[PDB]
Amino acid sequence: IVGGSDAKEGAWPWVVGLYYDDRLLCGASLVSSDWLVSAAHCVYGRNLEPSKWTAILGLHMKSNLTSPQTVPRLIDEIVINPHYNRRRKDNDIAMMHLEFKVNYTDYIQPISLPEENQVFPPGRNCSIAGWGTVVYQGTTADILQEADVPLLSNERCQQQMPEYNITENMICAGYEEGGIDSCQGDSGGPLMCQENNRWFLAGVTSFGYECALPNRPGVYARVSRFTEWIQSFL
Template sequence: MTNRAETLVFFILLLIISVRSTTYQCDPTIQCGCSAQSTVVTSRIVGGEAAADYTWGWMLSLQRSFSHTCSASLLTSEYAVTAAHCVYGVIDISILSILAGTNYLYNTSITTIQRRAVTMVTIHPDFNPVTITNDIAILEFAPLTITSSSKLAFICLPEQNQDPFQTNSNLVAIGWGTTLQWSKTPSSYLQQVTVQAFSSTSTQCQRSGITNTTLSFCAGIIGGGKDTCQGDSGGPLMAFVNNSWVLAGVTSFGYGCAQAGYPGVYTRVSVFISFINSNVDFSVPATATRTSQTETDTTTVLMMIPTAIQNTNQSIFSGNHGNAIYEPMTVMRLWFSVLNCFLLCYLS
């Protein structure tokens, strides 16, 4: 009797897991949005799960002095997109590099790993470090080797001003960020998590600190438990459209990590297609249905940050930005978490 009961419980649990998992099969013949591991299975477990090797071939670790600080998404062999706050205030870009071709941050024996020094950083000219709007930047580096054995791929871009998702759509975020809110140590292995797009006018989204819903949007879980966190900044939030993965958002900031009622805030990539096109040489198309450029943006190419801007940045986040990169994803979430904890303790 006991054995039968245990068997029944096992099959019930197996059924629950299978129902809650989602399998995505991308088209390996397309030029973007499909990696070497074309089948992606997301189990939607609380807090995320380990990504299968070579599932996300466009995922890059953006590093400072060989230490992970943010993420970026590969657009071509020479360009990637990240969050502006990840590189804002960096005086000497020679400390920046990207790591590609691996899910492991610290296993240097992986044969597909490629590292490149960042040679140019282009921050959106209207990036506001106070409101964290226009939080997008382009990285340029020496060409990565793109072959069938390199396991690298390019992420697709949405059309100008056309989001590849709707409210409540499932979106997948990936990153090496911390898996615990109070931790400062990045995950050693790439994680993935499924979240949902929130209405920009929702109470939860407004509560998370979004200031411009045209330039940003919210995604998370109403009950909390699944979210991006410190170290995930700059990484992709992706929609699965027409059998390919499309860059819907860039991880920007949030209120704490995975707190109920506080979704994360992401840069709305569809608004910035002309900025991306103006600063990326798409010698190989890497766009789902990339539109022609209709306007020219004035861009800010950063090799050295003016002193006035440095001082402004330091007054917001504190610290010496010649030696460190401070992320709103880290600072804001930790600050709000401390404030939230204080209020709860005080009121109790």
């Protein structure tokens, strides 16, 4: 997360760190007692042996894994979206099963899915979080980073990303001036929007042109388009 700040303990109890080979590579979002939503590209090429992935729930700081609020879980099933296209980056979403269920605490809670036509309108501030790089091509965060980013229209996002195919399966967020954005290591994590004092998983952190550049927004897989598919696992 570029231009964010340190999240407090228990700020985003749905945020999950995904470890492969003892390295935190991607984020994820807890959506039930045993299912995570993440990005397909995180797990592409590494889904045949799901027990190579470890989810750390209730994580705040990577340098304090052994604290009472954290819970580790091996993944025993990974289901990439059947319409995932690697080259075009479309439908960049995946389901990941926890081998054993988690009990909910102040630090571990599921995030609500959107309603199937739910509108998170352009100009509204939503939130992002993760342990990814803090500047483009820089170092990873120790403490979980958070930031607020305003949503774009898909038309405006397409104009700003003419080298990419911005589809209806994507939602974009970023500042005109840059400075605040997701980055490498944050993918698979949430874009969360609040409405009526309830947080909703509006997006899954997917891609962009570098990070934090002016008029180069974060592109997120639009979760409302996959609600029905996600709900079939729960």
